[PDB]
Write a protein that binds this ligand. Structure first.
Ligand SMILES: Nc1ncnc2c1ncn2[C@@H]1O[C@H](COP(=O)(O)OP(=O)(O)OP(=O)(O)O)[C@@H](O)[C@H]1O
Ligand SMILES: Nc1ncnc2c1ncn2[C@@H]1O[C@H](COP(=O)(O)OP(=O)(O)OP(=O)(O)O)[C@@H](O)[C@H]1O
Ligand SMILES: Nc1ncnc2c1ncn2[C@@H]1O[C@H](COP(=O)(O)OP(=O)(O)OP(=O)(O)O)[C@@H](O)[C@H]1O
Lengths: 1030, 103, 461, 105
């Protein structure tokens, strides 16, 4: 609720004075330990999250008057701060107490107060030195107690809550990195370092576009209701005192002749804008496109002195939006509304920005409403989405006044006439972020240093633009292509266009096509594009002609197709190229860019005719990091949070990790993950809100939410892709894993987890080959590696490759390898390589086909390790004695890991507990007895069969018991209920529940026989020994 | 040589990265969690302030092979050709030398 | 089809309007199909999105989306699957652009709701463009629901009433695999054929119910030639004791102790193969144990899938598997599987190989697809792929052995003493207490088919 | 429907056929109830076009099918005590979706 506010410098944890009217609402509560949350106006969209504070009553405070410590925030109220705030006293809920919190103390404080051996005395000293009371004080994260010497870092479970000296978790940490030294409150920097006091007329200062709109309720002093709202600029109070002018005054900004007026106010502390700077809306900046530093001088012109104009000629600024016939009506209506709002201030040659919600374009709404103020309150029912530009071409005055150059426009007295269109370059993104100021869908800001392709493409436009200005014409064209969709190549095109402040001419191929089959398609398309261009291009250069999904039109066609279609395609393409050439010629400086999903599909002729050809690849690790930063940015998160509460995530998120797991995705996937995290956050927040009734302030997103969102997105992507072999496996399902844990982890994940260390041009571990009794878990262990480490998996059985004579065997391994290269990261498995990798050189087969296969696999396995990081080869053998020795060499296989018969009872114990982890076992089961019972010759598959047979036996017992129940109850009740009916409704839970006894396992074990003969065990051990020896 | 060097450049300071910043002290009435969860994060949850990359550090030192390394590699690396293959192909090369192989 | 989605959406629209104040724009896709021209439509979607925005929040809905926006069925014949874009695909892209632009512009206001009959049928573009967050499939109704469906259906005709002895629970038991439309049609049938005989005061009867069901042909089974009526029972086949026990342990045991297997937490054994001597009864014991279980039976022979086109055969396999899965608990059977999915490397065009991987996708595909009881027979199992016989991956296989003295006597006694379907007495004029023992002696090495043929020609003599 | 169609290809075909049947039936039916609407070789219009055919014709056939179904439903709703009978020489051809929607066989 709206309550007056003032700042006292009594300390961060000093009590907050509350006016008695505020105190009354607490009422039944203690009335002495009153706690209230606050929200402070934020200079831009969104609201500062409410901070909870301990308050005390004070009648001296006037009606609805409160006092809060400014030092609590990083500033003291030297200059005036916000007059008001939004206060809320929580009545039903009480202040939560944070069990754990994080702090920071300077080195000297650590080494001095730590001297005491007792923590209670130290915390008592902390209370004395900081006025913090247990069960009385509330602590927030990122709170500063000493000016660069005391810090609060983190709080748990919540980021703020009541303090309990004894029971609370408190972290005693120091500042050994000298970070606290630089920590200082805003406005605390200057110990009144007296700036030069003078009556200087002009003071050259730097200019900055307003990051976001400023609400009028923050104008101290408040201005008049009817004052025009489009001519305001702001800065620190010190600048005004240097100009010895007051907030709400008129001051003239001039640079090399071009001058304008502006209404100037002060920025209420706390700050957040660069000091010694002048902030102006785009209105001012546009007139100063090339001026960052500009001169500012006082003004003595009074409001009454401003002349009133009668007729003003305005030439609409040339622009892509301006040429849309679909919008002319709505743009004109919003234009007329903009003047009808109130008296306008303008000068000759001035520019006018107008914003409108294009979605409301075709719906001409309530124009017959004569001079109705209600139009204001459709505005929030509207939301302006896109902007257009206007040029002050001429103003007509009827009397010579003091302020002849400037002038005022009144709808009841001033007439306006639209005129021809005038060209004007759009402001570069550097001078202002129009989307951000107007709160549109801000386009992701690249860091050119991390997006080399974007840098390369940009390195084209400005050079062309300069050479054109330098009198050098050159038809600079470029075509974007990619191997996968959903990469935002159009987004990067828009980003580049705004970066250079160049007009954009976007034409979706998949929007205006008509019938591209009849003998009109070529003509209709060419005419439509030509019309959409000629109407804007003459007054819009420099700009770019962008064709989205250009390939859709230019479809290369095979001969056997209908010849007429071939001819029509040849036309469409040739005249398309001719139109491009004519466009380039007629208007020098224009450049053409096209977006294509597949570079190859474009006809070769035009492609050659194209100048620059660039592919946009999938985002990389650091690129994913930047994308996550962008989306998770509060500005990106709160674009459309109409609900008052803001959204945000805890600082404890390891963005680097989320990037890591973000491999093999696209920007839309990342946006989907972020919005899914938004889902989970809002859902859980509303759940808690109904549960407890207290709002944990804003909404938060936890790393688990994003992890699960990426999991689900990857599941959908996988269903889209071929790889079906990553469903679900973990270590709990398989034992016998600890024996080679170190080797497997070092071989697999270390190169992935430390590539820069492996970027030494070193042979990355080629692969792993496993051998031993079948069913021991070799394939299961490989699947565990794949699923835990999340690499695309395909299983290939060597024997399946062999054909009658040689249909296709080498080509097949080549296809699997290349498709693996597409689906990086990935893991490839060969089942029974011995059946495809036998010892060669001694025997002579019939045809010798296999020799080339083994040579090819050797050569490929050696050729991938050099650079092909992310793809790894693993083979499976059960009779390695047949395996060719050439593979045993490092480079083909270096870690000949083994998975043998379970010798010790621990192996069988782990295997059985992993197998029956999800069995509904009676307590009688004592698996040690079974492990001793099982001869060591039993393998993992033997244990799987054992568990399955024990389930079968137990289900048989339960079935016999159920049949006995059925018969008994049948005789008792006199009817004949079918088993199905008995199970649908008569069956209670115990009927549907399965109970397992040790007797079932004993029966299964007695029924099971060695899957491997002891002679086979000795053969396997001998083969092991012989291979391990060398 | 690189296997030898794995104890020459990796031995530097602590395991690759930054360490030896330890934990200072605690005040809990039972909550004695000193693990990295509240150690790596919190104080320095970011590895460094706005962490990024820098000049060559991971592979600063090349594992320059030594005369002993080459000596032992020679003996470890067995001949890739059996004498039977050598003599057979040489004899066949002479047989075609009677006609073409040579002059 | 037939799950009454349309009414689901109408009831929805009603509830959402009454409870949460969302402007809703219902529009069936049939009308748009009426004039599915790109520009004309583009205009309509503009109008829609504009109006829907005009009332924030809004909700679009389109029953039968596939009708208009449904991408032509994947292949559709043209090798140029890429490069060129189907008109409806362009329309979907247009709609996507508008709605997603508004969404980023305003998540709250507009929330579309599509309605289709299959994920693949619906154009995948929306999926690839991440337009759809999550989807729900309307499964066939359950018996417990069918109770209330019928209790409201014949309520609609308030005149008719059930019988005291009969109960809605019955209706649920016999009814199955019937969508609400199917239950509607069945109740209309029962009302009409009840009005046939005007003796009772429109009271249900067991006999009219049975006659109606017998005459009934539900949509799911409609349009399919289910070769099920064979009437081969235990009495028709008595030998192969081990095969009988294994088949009971596989088929009858689940249907007879479902409660126990419900929590049996390994995935149940999918199905078993049959092999043995030609004509040795592999086609017979399967049907006999199917009747034992009373489960749904389908006999699929090698040819049914095989076709002329390449790629179309795979989709024929696809909807074959769709039908098979739709009828849990059902038995699917493939005869002459040696002519269906042999070992790879036995085809120049490789259509056999791709077909085989297609088949493997389903069984190896862990999608809760286990109610269908897969089955197959072949006299030449050697010709099948080993992967199709991997233990654990696939279940046991059943051998058929030579009928020796014991088995020969068993089969001879069974067939000679067979009670007729038309008459009930012996199928043959059976010697009351002749010496059937000596007959088996001279039939060493025969086959049950040979034994029955011997008896048949003896009956002719 | 085997005789008077007078049009089977043109995209207007579906509209022409449906409009003609609707025109005649609503022209005569209102004053003639009770009555029966009979379609001879009804299948010759309704069928399940194979995927082995150009798409737009499949769309046209799906349309004509849907409007036939809507026509029968509208006629029965608007004219109580009215029924129809259809004749077909093979069940397999008629749209299964349509068949399910009907009552008697
Ligand atoms: N870093 C980014 N790169 C690309 N797109 C991004 C990025 N961040 C956000 N996006 C969003 O992803 C979408 C990119 O779509 P866009 O049409 O530009 O893709 P494209 O690569 O041309 O793909 P296609 O033509 O196959 O759909 C936009 O909605 C854009 O706002
Ligand atoms: N709540 C309900 N849900 C589903 N069906 C219902 C419901 N109540 C009644 N039914 C019956 O289900 C059938 C609904 O048919 P409907 O035409 O709506 O099918 P649909 O599955 O929506 O598909 P389509 O419109 O494409 O044919 C009718 O026979 C109706 O009597
Ligand atoms: N026990 C039996 N064993 C074999 N055939 C029997 C037996 N009892 C009856 N028959 C009759 O013998 C014939 C069995 O041939 P059937 O084709 O059904 O067998 P199959 O083993 O499935 O062979 P195939 O796969 O070659 O068709 C049928 O005519 C059946 O009526």
């Amino acid at each position: 609720m709206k309550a007056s506010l003032t700042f006292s410098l009594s300390g961060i944890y000093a009590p907050c004075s509350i006016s008695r009217d505020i105190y009354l609402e607490y009422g039944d509560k203690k009335a002495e330990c009153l706690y209230g949350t606050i929200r402070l106006p934020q200079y831009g969209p969104g609201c500062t999250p409410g901070k909870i504070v301990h308050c005390v009553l004070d009648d001296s405070l006037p009606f609805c008057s409160i006092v809060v410590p400014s030092k609590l925030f990083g500033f003291m109220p030297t200059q005036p701060t916000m007059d008001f705030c939004y206060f809320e006293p929580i009545l039903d809920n009480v202040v939560p107490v944070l069990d754990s919190v994080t702090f920071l103390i300077n080195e000297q404080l650590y080494s001095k107060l730590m001297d005491l051996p007792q923590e209670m005395q130290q915390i008592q000293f902390l209370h004395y030195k900081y006025n913090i009371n247990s069960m009385e004080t509330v602590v927030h994260s990122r709170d500063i107690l000493t000016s660069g010497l005391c810090q609060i870092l983190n709080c748990s479970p919540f980021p703020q809550g009541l303090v309990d000296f004894t029971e609370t978790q408190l972290i005693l940490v120091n500042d050994t990195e000298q970070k606290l030294s630089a920590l200082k409150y805003a406005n605390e920097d200057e110990e009144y370092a007296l700036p030069k006091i003078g009556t200087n007329s002009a003071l050259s200062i730097d200019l900055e576009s307003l990051p976001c709109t400023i609400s009028r309720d923050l104008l101290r002093p408040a201005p008049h209701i009817n004052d025009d709202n489009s001519i305001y600029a702001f800065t620190d109070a010190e600048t005004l005192l240097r100009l010895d002018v007051t907030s709400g005054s008129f001051i003239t900004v001039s640079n090399m002749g071009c001058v304008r007026l502006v209404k100037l106010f002060v920025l209420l502390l706390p700050n957040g804008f660069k000091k010694r700077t002048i902030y102006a809306p785009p209105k001012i900046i546009a007139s100063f496109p090339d001026c960052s530093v500009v001169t500012i001088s006082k003004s003595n012109i009074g409001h009454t002195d401003i002349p009133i104009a009668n007729q003003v000629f305005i030439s609409r600024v040339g622009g892509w939006l301006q040429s849309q016939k679909c919008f002319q009506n709505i743009i004109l209506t919003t234009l007329k509304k903009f003047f009808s709002e109130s008296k306008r201030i303008l000068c000759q040659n001035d520019l006018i920005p107008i914003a409108f919600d294009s979605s409301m374009a075709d719906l001409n709404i309530a124009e017959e409403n004569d001079e109705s103020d209600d139009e204001d309150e459709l505005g929030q029912y509207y939301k302006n989405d896109s902007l257009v530009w206007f040029f002050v071409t001429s103003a007509e005055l009827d009397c010579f006044s003091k302020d002849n150059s400037h002038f005022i426009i009144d709808p009841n007295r001033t007439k306006l006439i639209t005129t021809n269109i005038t060209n004007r370059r759009p402001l570069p993104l550097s001078r202002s972020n129009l989307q951000r100021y107007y709160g549109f869908a801000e386009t992701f800001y690249y860091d050119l240093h991390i997006f080399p392709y974007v840098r390369q493409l940009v390195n084209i436009l400005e050079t062309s633009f300069n050479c054109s200005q330098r009198g050098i014409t050159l038809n600079a064209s470029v075509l974007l292509h990619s191997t996968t969709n959903n990469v935002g190549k159009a987004t990067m095109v828009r980003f580049a266009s705004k970066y250079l402040g160049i007009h954009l001419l976007e034409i979706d191929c998949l929007s205006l096509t008509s019938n591209s089959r009849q003998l009109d398609s070529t003509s209709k398309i060419i005419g439509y594009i030509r019309a959409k261009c000629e109407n804007v291009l003459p007054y819009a250069s420099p700009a770019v002609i962008f064709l989205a999904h250009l390939d859709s039109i230019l479809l290369d066609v095979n001969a056997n197709q209908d010849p007429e279609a071939i001819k029509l395609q040849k036309s469409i393409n040739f005249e398309m190229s001719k139109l491009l050439d004519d466009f380039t010629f007629k208007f020098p400086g224009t450049t053409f860019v096209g977006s294509v999903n597949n570079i190859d599909n474009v006809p070769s002729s035009f492609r050659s005719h194209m100048r620059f050809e660039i592919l946009v690849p999938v985002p990389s690790e650091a690129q994913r990091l930047r994308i996550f930063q962008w989306y998770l940015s509060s500005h990106e998160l709160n674009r459309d949070v109409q609900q008052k509460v803001p959204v945000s995530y805890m600082d404890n998120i390891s963005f680097s990790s989320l990037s890591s797991y973000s491999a093999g995705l696209t920007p839309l996937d990342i946006k989907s993950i972020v919005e899914t995290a938004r889902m989970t956050a809002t859902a859980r927040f509303y759940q808690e809100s109904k549960k407890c009734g207290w709002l944990p302030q804003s909404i938060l997103i936890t790393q688990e939410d994003l992890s699960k969102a990426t999991s689900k997105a990857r599941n959908e992507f996988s269903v889209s892709i071929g790889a079906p072999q990553i469903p679900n496996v973990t270590w709990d399902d398989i034992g016998g894993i600890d024996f080679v844990k170190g080797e497997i982890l070092d071989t697999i994940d270390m190169p992935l987890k430390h590539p820069e260390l492996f970027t030494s041009g070193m042979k990355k571990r080629s692969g792993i080959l496993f051998y031993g009794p079948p069913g021991t878990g070799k394939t299961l262990m490989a699947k565990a590696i794949a699923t835990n480490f999340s690499l695309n998996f395909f299983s290939v059985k060597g024997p399946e490759l062999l054909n009658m004579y040689i249909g296709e065997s080498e080509a097949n391994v080549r296809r699997v390898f290349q498709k693996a290269r597409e689906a990086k990261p990935c893991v490839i498995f060969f089942d029974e390589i011995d059946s495809v990798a036998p010892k060669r050189g001694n025997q002579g087969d019939s045809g010798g086909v296999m020799d080339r296969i083994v040579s090819q696999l050797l050569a490929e396995l050696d050729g991938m390790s050099t650079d092909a990081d992310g793809v790894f080869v693993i083979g499976a053998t059960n009779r390695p004695d047949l395996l060719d020795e050439a593979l045993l060499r490092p480079g083909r296989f270096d870690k000949l890991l083994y998975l043998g018969i379970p010798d010790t009872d621990t192996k069988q114990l782990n295997i059985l507990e992993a197998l029956t982890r999800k069995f509904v076992l009676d307590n009688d089961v004592k698996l040690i007895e079974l492990a001793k019972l099982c001869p060591f010759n039993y393998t993992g598959a033997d244990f799987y069969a054992l568990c399955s047979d024990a389930m079968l036996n137990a289900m048989s017992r339960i079935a016999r018991m159920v049949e006995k129940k059925v018969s008994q109850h049948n005789e008792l009740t006199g009817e004949n209920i079918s088993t199905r009916r008995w199970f649908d409704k008569i069956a209670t839970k115990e009927d549907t529940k399965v109970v397992v006894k040790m007797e079932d396992f004993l029966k299964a074990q007695e029924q099971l026989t060695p899957s491997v003969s002891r002679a086979e065990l000795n053969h396997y051990e001998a083969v092991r020994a012989n291979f391990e020896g060398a | 040589s690189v296997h030898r060097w794995l104890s020459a450049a990796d031995q530097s300071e602590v395991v690759p990265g930054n360490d030896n910043i330890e934990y200072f002290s605690i005040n809990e009435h039972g909550r004695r969690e000193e693990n990295r969860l509240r150690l790596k994060t919190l104080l320095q949850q970011d590895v460094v302030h706005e962490t990024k990359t820098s000049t060559s550090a991971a592979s600063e030192l090349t594992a320059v092979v030594t005369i002993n390394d080459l000596l032992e590699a020679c003996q470890e690396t067995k001949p890739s050709i059996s004498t039977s293959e050598l003599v057979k192909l040489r004899g066949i090369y002479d047989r075609f030398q009677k006609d073409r192989n040579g002059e | 089809q037939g799950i009454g989605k349309t009414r689901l959406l109408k009831e929805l629209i009603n509830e959402v309007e009454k409870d949460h104040h969302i402007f809703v724009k219902y529009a069936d896709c049939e009308t748009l199909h009426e004039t599915s021209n790109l520009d004309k439509t583009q205009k309509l979607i503009m109008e829609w999105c504009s109006f829907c925005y005009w009332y924030g929040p809004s909700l679009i809905v389109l029953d039968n989306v596939e009708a208009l926006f449904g991408k032509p069925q994947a292949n559709d014949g043209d090798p140029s699957n890429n490069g060129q874009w189907d008109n409806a695909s362009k329309l979907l892209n247009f709609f996507i652009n508008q709605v997603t632009k508004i969404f980023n512009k305003d998540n709250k206001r507009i929330r579309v709701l599509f309605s289709g009959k299959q994920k693949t049928q619906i154009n995948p573009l929306l999926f690839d463009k991440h337009f759809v967050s999550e989807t729900w499939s309307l499964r066939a109704p359950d018996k417990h629901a069918r109770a209330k469906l019928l209790e409201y259906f014949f309520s609609k005709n308030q005149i008719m009433k059930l019988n005291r002895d009969l109960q809605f629970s019955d209706l649920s038991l016999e009814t199955e695999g019937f969508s609400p439309l199917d239950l509607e049609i069945f109740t209309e049938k029962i009302f009409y054929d009840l009005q046939l005989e005007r003796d009772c005061d429109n009271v249900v009867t067991r006999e009219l119910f049975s006659k109606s069901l017998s005459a009934f042909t539900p949509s799911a089974l409609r349009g399919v030639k289910l070769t099920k009526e064979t009437n081969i029972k235990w009495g028709d086949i008595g030998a192969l004791a081990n095969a009988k026990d294994v088949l009971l342990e596989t088929l009858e045991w689940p249907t007879k102790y479902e409660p126990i297997f419900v929590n049996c937490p390994l995935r149940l054994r999918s199905g078993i193969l049959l092999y043995g001597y030609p004509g040795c009864g592999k086609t017979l014991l399967a049907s006999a144990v199917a009747q034992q279980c009373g489960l749904n039976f389908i006999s699929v022979k090698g040819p049914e899938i095989l076709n002329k086109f390449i790629g179309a055969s795979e989709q024929n396999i696809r909807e074959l598997f769709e039908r098979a899965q739709s009828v849990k608990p059902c038995i699917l059977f493939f005869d002459e599987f040696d002519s269906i999915a042999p070992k790879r490397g036995h085809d120049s065009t490789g259509v056999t190989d791709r077909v085989v991987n297609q088949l493997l996708t389903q069984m190896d595909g862990a999608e809760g697809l286990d109610g269908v009881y897969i089955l197959a027979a072949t006299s030449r199992p050697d010709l099948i792929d080993s992967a199709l016989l991997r233990p654990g991956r696939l279940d046991k296989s059943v051998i058929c052995n030579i009928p020796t003295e014991s088995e020969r006597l068993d089969i001879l006694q069974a067939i000679v003493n067979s009670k007729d379907k038309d008459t009930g007495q012996k199928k043959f004029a059976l010697e009351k207490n002749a010496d059937l023992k000596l007959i088996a002696e001279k039939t060493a090495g025969f086959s049950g088919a040979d034994l029955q043929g011997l008896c048949y020609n003896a009956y002719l003599k």
